């Protein structure tokens, strides 16, 4: 269903893209979104789907908007408008000057000194999961690795019981790829409901886990409130449960159809960090946005105050103007240009954690299970949203070709 065209939007900019169900999804998520960059399509379009919002389609405009926070505010960053109004997570729902103080604390708990201390646990979990899959000759990758590997590391780091993973994953799923069973406002309230007793517990006893450090924190030298801590801990949960989980499956789906690319990493394992960077461009998967604070002319188009604008982080690196032949994976690409981890003052805080988990996954999977493919006759289903995902990934291999380490 389409929302009526607002009077102030020129009819010739209308392109009805549905970000939660793009029309070409069967060809792949990123391919479905890349129809926005055909030569007939302008740099700035209006979709009447999902209540009606702008979409910037080129990397040049996506970067400009994310730098200019005084016109493009993160107070309402999700589409549909109801979701963006309920969205109050910290730091992303704040602009500078208020935003920067909370970043320091969030950085403190997923920052690089934390990741170095976790190296053995990351490595031993990756090996423990993979060695337990190897003699089976089959897995459901999303259930059996992509979810438990990054999510158990995050629950360990935050100090939360592993038994709570299915309830929490379902709620964060409803905030990024909704089912229809919950609105965003309801999923958010249920996740706040979960954190409220935990946060009051850990403000009593100072501690080393990520919730304690946030709940006992100061921001620009003043005590963080219980409510501010709730809104920051919830955002950490969403990042920990949704991003790497889904990115891993996209990568592994590609490697399972691309033996040429598999073989390249098997023989030259020191290409792995670079391949990580080029998989992150090709299979970029986040797309959120901003809301206009004032009437503003932007690349010839008159935006009204309160218009929402989708600024898909995913599209910048798929733009041919930023990377030649963008849909080819080329692990020796010379200048890998992308905005997979965002742009501007809201640059991703967990990218050190993310990169370690991806590189450890590629290294430990390929040395033990070098060859695998998609289970015969299965077609991989995808789902699009704020964070796009792979719905299921059946893999198979012959265990006689594996290597026990």
Closer CB to K ion, residue 66 or residue 87? 87
Reported in sequence order, the residue ranges of 192-270 that DSSP labels E, i.e. its strands, are 218-219, 222-223
Among 28, 91, 239, 289, binds ligand CAM (CB under 6 A): 239
Q: Which among 58-66, 187-195, 203-211, 236-244 is the span making contact with ligand CAM, rule CB under 6 A?
A: 236-244
28 binds ligand HEM (CB under 6 A): no
Among 94, 106, 238, 380, binds ligand CAM (CB under 6 A): 238
Both tokens of 280, joined, read 């992150």
243 binds ligand CAM (CB under 6 A): yes
- The span from the CA of 343 to the CA of 358, in Å, is 21
Nearest to 273 by CA among 357, 390, 349: 357
Of residues 108 through 137, those in contact with ligand HEM by CB under 6 A are 110
19 binds ligand HEM (CB under 6 A): no
Closer CB to ligand HEM, residue 42 or residue 342? 342
- The span from the CA of 154 to the CA of 117, in Å, is 13
Closer CB to ligand HEM, residue 101 or residue 402? 101
- The span from the CA of 319 to the CA of 335, in Å, is 13
Site string for ligand CAM, 123-162 (x = CB under 6 A): ----------------------------------------
Could you say which of ligand HEM, ligand CAM, K ion, none residue 386 binds, taking C-beta under 5 to 8 angstroms by partner kind? ligand CAM
Contacts 24+ apart (CB under 8 A), 20-28: 20/50, 20/177, 20/178, 20/384, 20/385, 21/384, 22/384, 25/382, 25/384, 28/382
Measured CA distances, 243 to 134, 246, 249 (Å): 25, 6, 11
Among 87, 141, 194, 397, binds K ion (CB under 5 A): 87
Of residues 336 through 395, those in contact with ligand HEM by CB under 6 A are 340-342, 346, 348-350, 353-354
Q: How many CB atoms lie within 10 A of CB 36?
A: 24
Nearest to 375 by CA among 96, 120, 144, 116: 144
Among 22, 28, 59, 77, binds ligand HEM (CB under 6 A): 77
Determine the length of the chain.
405
Could you say which of K ion, ligand HEM, ligand CAM, none residue 353 binds, taking C-beta under 5 to 8 angstroms by partner kind? ligand HEM
Where does this chain bind ligand HEM (CB under 6 A)? 74, 77, 91-92, 103, 106, 110, 235-236, 239-240, 243-244, 247, 286, 288, 313, 340-342, 346, 348-350, 353-354
């Amino acid at each position: 269903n389409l929302a009526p065209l607002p009077p102030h939007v020129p009819e010739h900019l209308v392109f009805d893209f549905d970000m939660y169900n793009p029309s070409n999804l069967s060809a792949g998520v990123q391919e479905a979104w890349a129809v926005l960059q055909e030569s007939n399509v302008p740099d700035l379009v209006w979709t009447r789907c999902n209540g009606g919002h702008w979409i910037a389609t080129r990397g040049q405009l996506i970067r400009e908007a994310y730098e200019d926070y005084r016109h493009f505010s993160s107070e309402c960053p999700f589409i549909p408008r109801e979701a963006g109004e309920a969205y109050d997570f910290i730091p992303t729902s704040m602009d500078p000057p208020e935003q920067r103080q909370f970043r320091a604390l969030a950085n403190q708990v997923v920052g690089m000194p934390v990741v170095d201390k976790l190296e053995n646990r990351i490595q031993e979990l990756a090996c423990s999961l993979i060695e337990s899959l190897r003699p089976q000759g089959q897995c459901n990758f999303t259930e059996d690795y992509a979810e438990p590997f990054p999510i158990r590391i995050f629950m360990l780091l935050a100090g939360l019981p592993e038994e709570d993973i299915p309830h929490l994953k379902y709620l964060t799923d409803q905030m990024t790829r909704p089912d229809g069973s919950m609105t965003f406002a309801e999923a958010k309230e249920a996740l706040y409901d979960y954190l409220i007793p935990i946060i009051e517990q850990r403000r009593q006893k100072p501690g080393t886990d990520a919730i304690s450090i946030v709940a006992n924190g100061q921001v620009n030298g003043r005590p963080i409130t219980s409510d501010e801590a709730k809104r920051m801990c919830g955002l950490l949960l969403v990042g920990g449960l949704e991003t790497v989980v889904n990115f891993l499956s996209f990568s592994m789906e590609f490697l399972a159809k691309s033996p040429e690319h598999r073989q390249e990493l098997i023989e030259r394992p020191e290409r792995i960090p670079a391949a990580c960077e080029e998989l992150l461009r090709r299979f970029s998967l986040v797309a959120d946005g901003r809301i206009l604070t004032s009437d503003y002319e932007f690349h010839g188009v008159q935006l009204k105050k309160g218009d929402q604008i989708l600024l898909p982080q995913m599209l910048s690196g798929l733009d041919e103007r930023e990377n030649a032949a963008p849909m080819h994976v080329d692990f020796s690409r010379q200048k890998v240009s992308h905005t997979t981890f965002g742009h501007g003052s809201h640059l991703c805080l967990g990218q050190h954690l993310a990169r370690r988990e991806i590189i450890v996954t590629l290294k430990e999977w390929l040395t033990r299970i070098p060859d695998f493919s998609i289970a015969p006759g299965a077609q991989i289903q995808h789902k699009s949203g704020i964070v796009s995902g792979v719905q299921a990934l059946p893999l198979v291999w012959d265990p006689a070709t594996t290597k026990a380490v």
